């Protein structure tokens, strides 16, 4: 199952394994049963270059998990500026809400990422 391997290589930050799996036709929009996508994983774990290669090959920038969290939400939570920048360039929805009614903007306030609050 290429999809599972991809999710795994992405969580692990294995940019080469990610690349090989994709060359082999792995679905960049693979999901576990909770709606967690490679983009969610790469965004949460700070894997900037994996985030970029997923988005280049048609990863859904606005996919949400079962709690309504998008990659933008997750990048916001850990405060990864470059990943946030890349997601926004690919048209991530700044006005998409999670379960707790919280926006990526709203998270930037909560965690006090002064620098995150503008883009």
């Amino acid at each position: 199952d290429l999809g599972k391997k991809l999710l795994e290589a992405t969580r692990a930050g294995q940019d080469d394994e990610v690349r090989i799996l994709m060359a082999n036709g792995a679905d960049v929009n693979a999901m576990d049963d909770a709606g967690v996508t490679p983009l969610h994983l790469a965004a949460k774990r700070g894997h900037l270059e994996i985030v970029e290669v997923l988005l280049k090959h048609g990863a859904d920038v606005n996919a949400s998990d079962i709690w309504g969290r998008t990659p933008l939400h997750l990048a916001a939570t850990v405060g990864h500026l470059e990943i946030v920048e890349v997601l926004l360039e690919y048209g991530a929805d700044v006005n998409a809400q999670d379960k707790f009614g919280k926006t990526a903007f709203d998270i930037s306030i909560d965690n006090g990422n002064e620098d995150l609050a503008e883009i």
Partner: protein, 94 residues
């Protein structure tokens, strides 16, 4: 003249307890529907409906656990929720 409640003789077989997410798999479908169909196939000729739904509860509660690459969502459990306003036993073979 004798009456029954307008609300009588309903059964609501929920996949999950109130408040809770209901788990599904992209390939096999939802945990509850999988279990419901399997229990109906095995027991519709053998057991009263409430007893079928109780095996469904046990099957979902014991045979399934969520897998997720995000720990927040991993190793989660589910119990369905039988809500009966039935006034009689229900046997499909009758």
């Amino acid at each position: 003249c004798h009456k029954i409640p307008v609300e009588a003789d309903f059964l609501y077989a929920y996949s999950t307890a109130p408040g809770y997410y209901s788990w599904r798999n992209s390939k096999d479908g939802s945990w509850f529907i999988q279990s419901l169909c399997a229990m109906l196939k095995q027991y519709a000729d053998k057991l009263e409906f409430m007893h079928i739904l109780t095996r469904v509860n046990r099957k979902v509660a014991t045979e399934f656990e969520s897998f997720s690459f995000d720990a927040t969502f991993h190793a989660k459990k589910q119990i369905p929720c039988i809500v009966s306003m039935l006034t009689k036993e229900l046997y499909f073979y009758h």
